């Protein structure tokens, strides 16, 4: 069968044919891959820097049930969940595997599960969001947004401390996000926070791509070129209710930007940094301690926030069509050996998605 | 009439007759005071660390209403609330200016408010919680405690975002809390923590002192002397759900704390920090992204959590009544002013809290 | 001014001009009516079952602003919320009348405040909903919509009290909803929870109609006749977790659907029930008590969930294209006077809305 | 060894020597029994109105711990949850059977389960409530006050839902709750309401008694005689926010108090009702829809709440002495058999607990 396969820890990728019966099979429901996703997370494990001698790589997948099986029916689109359980902590036996207390959870393509990037796979009905056949074409983004709608989710939970966090109007349009580095998860958080209401500004250390040029204009949505810090973001337009770092940049980015949360603020920890140190003064951690300040480190997306975000995905193809049309940049066959060995490599600039079809 | 003033932003502080008439008033009701209680926030405005010459000192009080009012009779007790509100902000609004969004809340003896170190003084029967004249003598420690109320009511408001964060029992039990540094807010955090069942273990740079034995002994909380870090600590208990910080030291505490803090755990900082900057480099970073940690800043408790601390104050005297008659450690009268001042100006080694007594 | 004019408790309905100066004005901004839709609500008015001679009908509408004010550009479709606060309790003070303490609040078109069937109006900027072009077709759905978004969100909020309600895969979609009477409120229950995820039983005294039938097939929802009763439902596929009343109907329909309420079950009250007495035995209450059943009353919807309704109606486009298309029943000219009164009079079999539209 | 046992579903009860061999075990702690408590759902099954030839009676139990097992010292007092988890379940799963979705859970001394009216039980220490030495006298009231802990938790988590339900000082203070029916439950209700600050009026159609009289005046609690219906308390006080039936009587009860909710208020149905059928006309049910109330059926006390009892019980001895005295109406040795059957076959006229003493 066609696969795509790394071998943790080492750096490499191969697109080649490999033994069906040695791969990891998680149910009784067929499905054939029509698109996969690929993300700077295979970006890392193609690169290293992360009785089976491989494993199968992709976390992102839209396939067609072969044949029906209970609510399935043949022809259906789907996508699978792609961390799963520990199977013995209470978060992993609620369903809820992105809260994990033993740490002893898989995730597809990555770490001890198989992944999609493969011709077909069996899974279990549990772990398969239906995607409607009208979102096809943008479906394959529910998976990255799903850890998104967790993290809004999760931000929306924690500021139910604060006695009233909405607006005069009973809602939450006075409330300001930065997100701090665009890209497809800062392009999702502004479209996630502009569904919802708030008020965003996109920052980044230059000016605006083409894509980005519309998200702002379809979304209404503010943008700051942070090149020289963030001290005229600060006198323009003063505080931000809730920050989030979406830059997978050096930790001082935290430094620029901890002094633009306002009273009551969360900061949200979203992307990995990989370099760096940050300083914390006692001053800056006296004035988090009294202002009820929060800093929370959000992390993976469950089935309730994949179906979340095929809700989210079908409005925008409504609301913010241009923008929708935008979020995937390139289709490349599986075999086209060249082109895909290329993008599962390296992100090209001002890349969204890159979506795999299989044919 | 008898007050204890202070003259911000100068240091220094005298107690003295004062004109009446240019003290502030808040209400209809008369209250004669018979207790203060005196904390670091006083000793920091007496040292000058923070039409009218001088501000009333003193937020920690327990007065006598001394006439019928409405609701409250001749001879009961009462206790006002420090922290009143900007009167625009709808957190104000709703009683609660712990999340004023404003900041122009009033801090009784600390700021805009004149305090309670007064003889006597009118207020709102609003901002007045009645204390039982069956805790007189612990029930000024309902002020201190209210802080740390709020503190707790936050965290577990916070971890409703963990689907499930009780235990196989249904409880919080099995859930551990390092308490880091032990005066009058560490030894309240563990009585409070050890009351809703939580496990605790304190951490001082030290063994014991005889109160804090006593309340190891008596609430069966554990203790490790952090002096040469906590690497043993980690070995030997693994990692904790909790960690306050109740130290008002370098903040590079937290570098020493923050590897111990478990999954989907919370950091609560509720200490002053004075001095230092503590460098959190990106693996540190990484590792809260990845195990959903949260960093949160605790500040000042409302008057629900006023009447919360009473229920408890009451309770410690039969579950805890070694613990609760050590947590006041000495009364100074009013008319005793070298001792007095001495108590204003400087904390005593192993002091808990220090009563002043009106006659 | 033309406007549809109505004078309570009397009935009757009349489109004249009438004296601008006399109708109620509530802010700055200027907003030319374009559709109304009309309910129930409307045609109680008109039929006379629920300083000013008359009121200006109406409380569901879509208007285009006049002016480019600051939020607001000249041509930007709005719509009011309908129901406005006291201006004295802590409910209305943070924006929701619809828990208002008093029950001195305003609803446009029914209440003190005259509603939206006129050429145009002026309005507060913080009581307007921007409503995309890219919905003006179905848009008018949203005030009817809002009053849906926040029963579920209440309902939802409320079953928090049950430690684990989510499934095995972290999801509602195990959870079952019966709605108890089709056509508008009924169809937009099924629609939006079916949204959510959760399995839905439609229930009528008949057989579905065309529209019905449409929603039915599309959105993968199941329908029962109860002509006869609900033993047949029951035997079948057991107990609801979620039973709607959104019929207008004899109260003796709660008495046939408590029985098919389950452990742990919320019966949601929304329809005003028009006539008769429901007896409940001690048998049916003490079995509420033994299984934490709950009964609530549902009504209002205000800003937060009208900007929901919105990017729910959007999404519909995409999900279930054929309902959606189906919302709208048809389209009255407001100068066609003899069609219009006959919809203002009376319901037609099977609608679902009727939109006015001005020219 | 001595037990008490019955034989259900018919009546009368014994108090002999049992086979040991079979009788239930539940772990590996053994437990001797030093009291029991009786309540009501005790005399129903003596009274026969609720592979085992019997079963041994007693859901309420203090027991002391033979053998220093895991956390638990050899002389430690425990106290067993009495309703067990199906063990299949999420709810059971997660330790709250009070939510069981199965029906499957077992009733220490009711259902499926020996109680613990005998002279020892073995145990899993899973199950065990420790019962601090300094409130042995009255911590039997912790098993009967856990369900009214649950209960009060469940109301205030439900109340949630109202945008600010919360007063002008932050507290519940102005909240006010009618409490109908003043047995154990009644007077538990009604010291745990005024312990959270809510204005309370118990009511019963009779002058109070004297232990009622008690914990009215040292709770500050109010008293309506009911004997003639609700008209002239709801036209001298208004109506309540919360609404208790604690009776057991017949459920007409419901109509008459019904009328006495306030809006947003909740009516807490928390007792068992034994006879009658209430009619509910539409006028009443529309109004209920209008003015978004909760009706809530109240089942079930788990270990948290246990704990939180424990806690509250030893608050009382200091806040409410004087009640905290009358709790206990009297003890009757397990040897003394004409005094033991008496109580069991039937209450006394203002009785809140009998313990039994095992000597
Ligand atoms: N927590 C989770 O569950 C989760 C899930 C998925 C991904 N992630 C992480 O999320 C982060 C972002 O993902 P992505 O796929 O969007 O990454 P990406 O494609 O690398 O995009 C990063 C964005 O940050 C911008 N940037 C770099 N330095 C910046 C700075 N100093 N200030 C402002 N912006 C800056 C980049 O600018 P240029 O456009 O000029 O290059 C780019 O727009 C990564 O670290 C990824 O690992 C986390
Ligand atoms: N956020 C709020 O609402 C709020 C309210 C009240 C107070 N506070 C702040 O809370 C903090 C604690 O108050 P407090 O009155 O208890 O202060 P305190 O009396 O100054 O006690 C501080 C404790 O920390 C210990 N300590 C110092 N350095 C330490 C270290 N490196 N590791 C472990 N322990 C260390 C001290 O040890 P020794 O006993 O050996 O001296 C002492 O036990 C202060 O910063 C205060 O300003 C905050
Ligand atoms: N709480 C709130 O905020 C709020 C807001 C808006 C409306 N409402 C109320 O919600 C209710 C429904 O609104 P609507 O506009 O959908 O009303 P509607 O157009 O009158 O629809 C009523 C539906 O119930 C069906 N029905 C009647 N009796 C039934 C029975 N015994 N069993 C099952 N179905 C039965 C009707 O059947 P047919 O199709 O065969 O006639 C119709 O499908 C009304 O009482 C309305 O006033 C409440
Ligand atoms: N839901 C749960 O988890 C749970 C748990 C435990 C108990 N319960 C139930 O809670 C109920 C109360 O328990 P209990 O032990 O307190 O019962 P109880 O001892 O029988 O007390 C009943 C009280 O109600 C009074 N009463 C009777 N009719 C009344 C009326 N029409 N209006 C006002 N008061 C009236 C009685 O008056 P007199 O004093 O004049 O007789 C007595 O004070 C029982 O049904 C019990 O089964 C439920
Ligand atoms: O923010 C939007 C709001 O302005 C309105 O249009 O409702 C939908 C939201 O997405
Ligand atoms: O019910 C739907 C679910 O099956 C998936 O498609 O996600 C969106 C939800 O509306
Ligand atoms: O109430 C607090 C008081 O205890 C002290 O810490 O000073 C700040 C106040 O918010
Ligand atoms: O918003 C509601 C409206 O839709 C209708 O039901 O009339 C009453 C209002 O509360
Ligand atoms: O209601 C009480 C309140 O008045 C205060 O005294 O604090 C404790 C509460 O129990
Ligand atoms: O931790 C305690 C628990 O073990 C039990 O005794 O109930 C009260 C709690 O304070
Ligand atoms: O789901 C997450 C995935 O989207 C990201 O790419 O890697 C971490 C996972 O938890
Ligand atoms: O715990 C409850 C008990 O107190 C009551 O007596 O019987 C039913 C149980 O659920
Ligand atoms: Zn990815
Ligand atoms: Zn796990
Ligand atoms: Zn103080
Ligand atoms: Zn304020
Ligand atoms: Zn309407
Ligand atoms: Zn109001
Ligand atoms: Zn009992
Ligand atoms: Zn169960």
Same mark, same amino acid.
């Not at 697109?15 to 499905?31: A, N, T």
């Given at each position: 069968?066609?696969?795509?396969?790394?071998?943790?820890?080492?750096?490499?990728?191969?697109?080649?044919?490999?033994?069906?019966?040695?791969?990891?099979?998680?149910?009784?429901?067929?499905?054939?891959?029509?698109?996969?996703?690929?993300?700077?997370?295979?970006?890392?494990?193609?690169?290293?820097?992360?009785?089976?001698?491989?494993?199968?790589?992709?976390?992102?997948?839209?396939?067609?049930?072969?044949?029906?099986?209970?609510?399935?029916?043949?022809?259906?689109?789907?996508?699978?969940?792609?961390?799963?359980?520990?199977?013995?902590?209470?978060?992993?036996?609620?369903?809820?595997?992105?809260?994990?207390?033993?740490?002893?959870?898989?995730?597809?393509?990555?770490?001890?599960?198989?992944?999609?990037?493969?011709?077909?796979?069996?899974?279990?009905?549990?772990?398969?969001?239906?995607?409607?056949?009208?979102?096809?074409?943008?479906?394959?983004?529910?998976?990255?947004?799903?850890?998104?709608?967790?993290?809004?989710?999760?931000?929306?939970?924690?500021?139910?401390?604060?006695?009233?966090?909405?607006?005069?109007?009973?809602?939450? @349009?006075?409330?300001?996000?930065?997100?701090?580095?665009? &890209?497809?998860? /800062? #392009? %999702?958080?502004?479209?996630? =926070?502009? *569904?919802?209401?708030?008020?965003?500004?996109?920052?980044?250390?230059?000016?605006?791509?083409?894509?980005?040029?519309?998200?702002?204009?379809?979304?209404?949505?503010?943008?700051?070129?942070?090149?020289?810090?963030?001290?005229?973001?600060?006198?323009?337009?003063?505080?931000?209710?809730?920050?989030?770092?979406?830059?997978?940049?050096?930790? @001082?980015?935290?430094?620029?930007?901890?002094?633009?949360? &306002?009273?009551? /603020? #969360? %900061?949200?920890?979203?992307? =990995?940094? *990989?370099?760096?140190?940050?300083?914390?003064?006692?001053?800056?951690?006296?004035?988090?301690?009294?202002?009820?300040?929060?800093?929370?480190?959000?992390?993976?997306?469950?089935?309730?926030?994949?179906?979340?975000?095929?809700?989210?995905?079908?409005?925008?193809?409504?609301?913010?069509?241009?923008?929708?049309?935008?979020?995937?940049?390139?289709?490349?066959?599986?075999?086209?050996?060249?082109?895909?060995?290329?993008?599962?490599?390296?992100?090209?600039?001002?890349?969204?998605?890159?979506?795999?079809?299989?044919?």
């Amino acid at each position: 069968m066609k696969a795509i396969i790394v071998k943790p820890p080492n750096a490499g990728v191969q697109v080649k044919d490999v033994d069906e019966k040695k791969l990891d099979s998680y149910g009784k429901i067929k499905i054939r891959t029509i698109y996969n996703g690929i993300c700077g997370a295979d970006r890392e494990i193609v690169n290293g820097k992360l009785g089976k001698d491989f494993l199968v790589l992709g976390h992102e997948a839209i396939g067609v049930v072969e044949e029906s099986y209970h609510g399935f029916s043949q022809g259906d689109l789907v996508m699978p969940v792609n961390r799963r359980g520990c199977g013995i902590c209470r978060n992993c036996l609620v369903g809820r595997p992105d809260f994990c207390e033993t740490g002893e959870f898989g995730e597809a393509g990555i770490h001890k599960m198989d992944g999609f990037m493969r011709e077909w796979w069996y899974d279990d009905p549990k772990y398969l969001v239906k995607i409607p056949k009208s979102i096809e074409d943008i479906g394959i983004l529910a998976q990255p947004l799903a850890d998104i709608e967790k993290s809004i989710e999760e931000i929306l939970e924690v500021q139910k401390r604060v006695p009233v966090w909405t607006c005069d109007d009973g809602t939450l @349009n006075c409330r300001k996000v930065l997100v701090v580095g665009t &890209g497809p998860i /800062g #392009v %999702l958080f502004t479209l996630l =926070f502009r *569904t919802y209401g708030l008020e965003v500004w996109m920052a980044n250390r230059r000016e605006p791509t083409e894509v980005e040029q519309t998200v702002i204009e379809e979304t209404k949505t503010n943008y700051y070129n942070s090149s020289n810090g963030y001290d005229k973001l600060k006198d323009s337009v003063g505080k931000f209710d809730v920050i989030i770092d979406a830059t997978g940049a050096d930790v @001082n980015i935290l430094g620029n930007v901890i002094p633009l949360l &306002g009273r009551n /603020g #969360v %900061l949200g920890l979203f992307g =990995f940094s *990989t370099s760096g140190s940050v300083p914390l003064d006692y001053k800056t951690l006296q004035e988090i301690v009294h202002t009820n300040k929060t800093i929370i480190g959000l992390v993976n997306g469950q089935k309730p926030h994949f179906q979340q975000a095929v809700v989210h995905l079908a409005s925008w193809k409504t609301l913010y069509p241009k923008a929708a049309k935008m979020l995937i940049t390139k289709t490349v066959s599986i075999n086209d050996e060249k082109e895909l060995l290329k993008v599962l490599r390296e992100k090209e600039h001002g890349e969204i998605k890159i979506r795999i079809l299989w044919e």
